[PDB]
UniProtKB/Swiss-Prot annotation:
Domain notes from UniProt: The ubiquitin-like domain mediates interaction with the proteasome. The J domain is functional and is shown to stimulate E.coli dnaK ATPase activity.
Gene (UniProt): SACS
Disulfide bond residue pairs: none
Free-text function comment from the UniProt entry: Co-chaperone which acts as a regulator of the Hsp70 chaperone machinery and may be involved in the processing of other ataxia-linked proteins.
Protein name: Sacsin
Annotated compartments: Cytoplasm
Amino acid sequence: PPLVDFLKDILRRYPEGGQILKELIQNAEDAGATEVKFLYDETQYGTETLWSKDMAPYQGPALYVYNNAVFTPEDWHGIQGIGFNSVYHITDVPCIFSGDQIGMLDPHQTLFGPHESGQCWNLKDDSKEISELSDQFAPFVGIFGSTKETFINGNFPGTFFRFPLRLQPSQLSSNLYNKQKVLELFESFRADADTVLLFLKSVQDVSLYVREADGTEKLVFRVTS
């Protein structure tokens, strides 16, 4: 059972595209986060200074998810009920930024090498490479308080994910996400939000946003317990 086929089957067996939203809230809860933010970002990034040209399909609109906890080493090991794997409903290349590290997962095992299932950069140890790959890392600044100085100094005291939305079929999935389909996820969560927060004791605030192409931000929904 190869990784891509395994995941493909899991996504067929657990078809609800929205599970990653409740799943990430649960993970934030376990981590002792007190707030979670979801943001649909329409921003298109450049495709020049990437790890490789094969990264270009992942430079467009993305769902971001923030929480105010920092990953432990164990959290990173865990990341690298179908758990995190529901993310693959919406993206082929989930990205994780927490503390001093950014990771990108690649179940296709094509982007980083035929023996690699992903890649990690340390903001300090790999600072030169990051700076070289400015288009690759631009999507990790200017959101949730991450600034250029975050990368210069090398620590972001929180967690966020970037899930570039699937715009063409892949070996994982035929399901494409656009703004409409992401807003459908947001509306479905909105319906269930009081029930989700019901049993949580750490996460007390969940908010959903859109950042438009011109940079304008719209509050879609916010729920507190």
